[PDB]
Amino acid sequence: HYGIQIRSVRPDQTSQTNVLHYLNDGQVTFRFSWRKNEYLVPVVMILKALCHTSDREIFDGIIGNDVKDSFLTDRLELLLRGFKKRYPHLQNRTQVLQYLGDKFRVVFQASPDQ
């Protein structure tokens, strides 16, 4: 029943919600809506797509100096290893981002040129 929700607005005052859900397995799920149906993405696919990351920088950006907090470390164990388990590929930014563009190619009405 837990989750977070932002309502981002564009500079032309157009809105777009982005919901993160918490699964009881230990992983989290990005959620959005482009047309009138929803889509569910794991967020490490989106964390590795936004910029050129390390994998400790995902750890060092959620965890502060509270390395000894064993709640936060163990729930983040499942989040990072779960992405390596499901996706043995998708290793740098230009390869995660082609997978994310391949699934949403037909729904974002992309050209045959893109």
Partner: protein, 58 residues
Amino acid sequence: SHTFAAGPSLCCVQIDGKIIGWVSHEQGKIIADTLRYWKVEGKTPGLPIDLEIGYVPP
């Protein structure tokens, strides 16, 4: 860009939905009491009176 910080032990300073930086809770109230004294006193050329500075204390 040079902070290495997260969590509620610090307080995150955000302007319109982006992170500007990180500062302590004790200094984060002092620079939330300072920015209200500087937007009401209209001598500062960057702080509008129409600004909303919502400080959430720990």
